Design a binder for this molecule. Sequence first.
Ligand SMILES: CC(C)CN(C[C@@H](O)[C@H](Cc1ccccc1)NC(=O)O[C@H]1CO[C@H]2OCC[C@H]21)S(=O)(=O)c1ccc(N)cc1
Lengths: 99, 99
Amino acid sequence: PQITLWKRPLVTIRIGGQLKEALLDTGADNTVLEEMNLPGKWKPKMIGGIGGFIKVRQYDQIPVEICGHKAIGTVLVGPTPVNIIGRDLLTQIGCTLNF
Amino acid sequence: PQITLWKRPLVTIRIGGQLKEALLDTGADNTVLEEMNLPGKWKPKMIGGIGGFIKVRQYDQIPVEICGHKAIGTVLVGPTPVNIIGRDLLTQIGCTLNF
Ligand SMILES: CC(C)CN(C[C@@H](O)[C@H](Cc1ccccc1)NC(=O)O[C@H]1CO[C@H]2OCC[C@H]21)S(=O)(=O)c1ccc(N)cc1
């Protein structure tokens, strides 16, 4: 699809049977999701945003379905203001900026 | 143009004859630029993301050129680590997300 930006680019994602709302975020290198349980091993990591650094749990090779499009990659889970889909997964689904 | 997300979507902008590199950022509601001393009046605001909030100044109607496309709007200015072009100005230059 083509998505204009007069509103926030919020889409429904599927991740582990759960349906969540997430923001398509071309400004994020990495996908970061709000607090949730995911299966498998994870590693403690840190990531920085506009306001400073946070602690996150890194889960590897997690599938997310983003508007019908499949992605599988590394996901970070921690105190983000909203679920954000970054460039890591936006590239997987074929996403570009056009003007 | 069509802009890939393999790398950070950095483009050249011009504001008051300052040429800067800025991020085309669909996750950002509003444009925020690195600290600079613009003329004119402003209001103080706070914006939040990963790590929490920072304090910024919102200036009134400034022309900004983004890859040769004219925009004009309020802009936020403060201690952001990167220049960020938000939806407020992405809509003005005809930017969409496509996949
Ligand atoms: C978290 C979003 C909902 C909002 N952010 C825009 C976002 O694109 C920032 C924009 C950004 C980009 C770089 C540095 C700081 C902020 N990205 C970001 O925090 O991504 C993080 C996850 O991947 C990592 O790669 C980039 C930083 C990490 S924000 O920077 O906090 C922000 C909030 C409000 C406005 N008006 C403008 C920007």
